């Protein structure tokens, strides 16, 4: 297993070195989005939590296609405020309930070290 703790202060530096295969060794869900919300990376732990097949969601828009329950001021609204500002670091609890059993999770959104990319980390609560 890859040893990185959910919510670590330097998580973006640690994950910058990770290929899709190493991202799959994380103890929590990790999704990398571009500024428009398109999925660039989606790890195995995230698929375990949500039921989505990782390879199938890459390239889809997270807010429009995959996760409509997140299209709200409380999730997507925070993401879009962060992209526009060029800075994002927020953690909050949320319930995923689209085409799945309602599941309570802790979400951490953070701007990646890379230019136009943002991370969404997820763990069960």
UniProtKB/Swiss-Prot annotation:
The 4-hydroxycinnamic acid (p-coumaric acid) chromophore is covalently bound via a thioester linkage. The modification S-(4-hydroxycinnamyl)cysteine is found at residue 69. One of its GO terms (biological process) is regulation of DNA-templated transcription. Pfam families: PAS. It comes from the Bacteria. Residues 23-86 form the PAS domain. One of its GO terms (molecular function) is identical protein binding. The keyword Ribonucleoprotein does not apply. Keywords: Chromophore, Photoreceptor protein, Receptor, Sensory transduction. The keyword Nucleus does not apply. Monomer. Photoactive blue light protein. Probably functions as a photoreceptor for a negative phototaxis response. NCBIfam families: photo_yellow. Belongs to the photoactive yellow protein family. This is Photoactive yellow protein. It comes from Halorhodospira halophila.
